[PDB]
Write a protein that binds this ligand. Structure first.
Ligand SMILES: *[C@@H]1O[C@H](CO)[C@@H](O)[C@H](O)[C@H]1NC(C)=O
Ligand SMILES: O=C(O)CSc1ncccc1[N+](=O)[O-]
Length: 351
């Protein structure tokens, strides 16, 4: 079990102004720290944030959070379930800012909701430093879905924060799971007239303004004012990052298909095959990646995350090989992208 700590800086809040927080399980003597960002979409205007507040309130508020959570998958402390980092210090950071971890805005007379995802991460890091993180050798910022995009948006800021605080020896790395999206053509098209019809590029453009969203500095400098939404797309932001980042992405991610309006005749067959080919292409020059040809969503905190393999190598093995590479390796690969073109052409895909 990981134990809840609400942030001592109560100005760093979830959407409704309740304190943000983190769940922690320390591992005495380990100098590895895993900070995991939860996912769960986002909201981008008053109306759709209000709807999310009614039926997804745990993603907008800490008022009903339980005192503990069980660590699963990469957050498990059992080597049977987590061959990779079972002995690490484990941190689960709940997603309660609805801003893809990008926001830097407080609730105020002008703002019904606070969007503080970028500041939540910084505050968690700050408060963990007094709880043992100061002695760390590696801080792996991991995340799934919107949390995986959050890794891409925040990993270099965590590195800069620790450098400025006087901890240049902590190696900051990122693990982005299911957060590598394409701003591709939808299978069927609708103009952005409401929440359902609004494609992510336009929803994110609106969200950035609504959240006071922030993106990594080098990416911001490339795309400039009004175009920061580009930095939410992994293939565009990744080349601007300095921290080592391992990318986990199903070739046929269910969230990608959702925003593409895909729910099989020749037109759709070709669409799906082209999606997989495009995703594969974006990963060609990503040296640490794991991209199985499956229709699914998230992997790293699932209890059976050890089951899927690409070219005979599981994700926990690939992550271990990545660790070794950061000290090519014989029989210990880190770039694992399926080449077969249809979901479940890999027999190890989740059932
Ligand atoms: C609390 O968090 C806010 C927002 O990130 C920050 O500006 C402020 O300096 C923090 N205060 C303390 C005492 O850490
Ligand atoms: O959290 C989830 O399940 C999905 S998040 C997502 N999905 C698709 C496109 C963009 C995003 N966003 O977060 O940048």
């Amino acid at each position: 079990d990981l134990r809840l700590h609400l942030l001592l800086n109560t100005s760093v809040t979830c959407n409704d102004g309740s304190p943000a927080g983190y769940y922690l399980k320390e591992s005495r003597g380990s100098r590895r720290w895993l900070l995991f960002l939860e996912g769960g979409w986002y909201c981008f205007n008053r109306e759709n944030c209000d709807s999310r507040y009614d039926t997804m309130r745990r993603l907008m508020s800490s008022r009903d959070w339980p005192r503990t959570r069980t660590g699963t998958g990469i957050l498990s402390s059992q080597p049977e379930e987590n061959p990779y980092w079972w002995n690490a210090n484990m941190v689960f950071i709940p997603y309660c800012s609805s801003d893809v971890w990008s926001g830097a805005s407080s609730k105020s007379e002008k703002n019904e909701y606070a969007f503080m995802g970028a500041l939540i991460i910084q505050e968690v890091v700050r408060e963990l430093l007094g709880r043992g993180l100061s002695g760390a050798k590696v801080l792996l910022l991991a995340g799934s879905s919107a949390g995986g995009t959050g890794v891409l948006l925040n990993v270099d800021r965590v590195a800069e924060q620790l450098e400025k605080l006087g901890y240049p020896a902590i190696q900051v790395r990122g693990l982005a799971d299911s957060g590598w999206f394409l701003d591709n053509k939808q299978y069927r098209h609708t103009d952005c007239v409401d929440t359902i019809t609004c494609a992510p590029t336009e929803a994110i453009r609106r969200g950035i303004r609504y959240w006071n969203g922030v993106v990594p500095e080098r990416c911001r400098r490339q795309f400039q004012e009004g175009e920061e939404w580009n930095c939410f797309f992994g293939y565009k932001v990744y080349p601007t990052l300095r921290s080592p980042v391992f990318v986990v992405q199903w070739l046929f991610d269910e969230a990608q298909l959702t925003v593409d309006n895909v729910h099989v005749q020749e037109g759709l067959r070709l669409y799906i095959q082209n999606l997989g080919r495009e995703l594969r292409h974006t990963l060609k020059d990503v040296p640490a990646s794991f991209a199985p040809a499956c229709l699914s969503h998230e992997i790293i905190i699932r209890s059976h995350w050890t089951d899927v393999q690409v070219k005979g190598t599981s994700l926990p093995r690939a992550l271990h090989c990545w660790d070794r590479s950061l000290h090519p390796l014989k029989g210990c690969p880190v770039h694992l992208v399926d080449s077969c073109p249809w979901p479940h052409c890999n027999p190890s895909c989740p059932t």
